[PDB]
Amino acid sequence: SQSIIAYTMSLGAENSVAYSNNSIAIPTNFTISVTTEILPVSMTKTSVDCTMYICGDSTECSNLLLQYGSFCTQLNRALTGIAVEQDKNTQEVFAQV
């Protein structure tokens, strides 16, 4: 009795309003409601050893890697910057008192 159907999506429940030039509506009762909200603040720190990953424990591969300049230094610096930024974020969001 269950099947896949297809239909034009409904924008919402239609609601006409009664405009006039001399009538107002003033509320007589109210409700207090509480609603939640969720925001990410930071992500897990992570550092990767460039030479270890690319040339694990091998001197020959280390020597061949030494030709490619400062790529490993660049990667290490970038990941260190991200790692510091995370603690900066937590400090800013929580340490207000």
């Binding site: 009538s23 107002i24 003033i26 109210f30 409601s33 969720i38 925001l39």
Partner: protein, 133 residues
């Protein structure tokens, strides 16, 4: 900063509706807010007028809007029904009644008027008593 440490007038920023206050809560790699908001619930239709002309002058509400149920006119807050007698402190006078489009006839009461009328009656009674001796 703008929700917990104070009250924010920004619309739909600190929760949907009329904001009152908030509570932070911790969570893994994040934060959760519990917005507390005020929402009007039950409404009723009424009859209104933009201004009131009593002594040939237009009166306008200092705070509130003119409202009537069909027989008498009162002032009420914007977001909550609370009728009150039309008095001088509620209204301020400016200009004449011709330029106001849609002005509606009615009397305007003065809270000083009955306080003075009580003294006038006391004075009249004292004057009448003064002829007795």
């Amino acid at each position: 900063s703008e929700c917990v440490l104070g009250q924010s007038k920004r619309v739909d920023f600190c929760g949907k509706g009329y904001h009152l206050m908030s509570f932070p809560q911790s969570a893994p790699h994040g934060v959760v807010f519990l917005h507390v908001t005020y929402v009007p619930a039950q409404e009723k239709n009424f009859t209104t007028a933009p201004a009131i002309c009593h002594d040939g002058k237009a009166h306008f509400p200092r705070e509130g809007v003119f409202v009537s149920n069909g027989t008498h006119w009162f002032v009420t807050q914007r977001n909550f029904y609370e009728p009150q007698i039309i008095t001088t402190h509620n209204t301020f006078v400016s200009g004449n009644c011709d330029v106001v489009i849609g002005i509606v006839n009615n009397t305007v009461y003065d809270p000083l008027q009955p306080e003075l009328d009580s003294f006038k009656e006391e004075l009249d009674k004292y004057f009448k008593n003064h002829t007795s001796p």
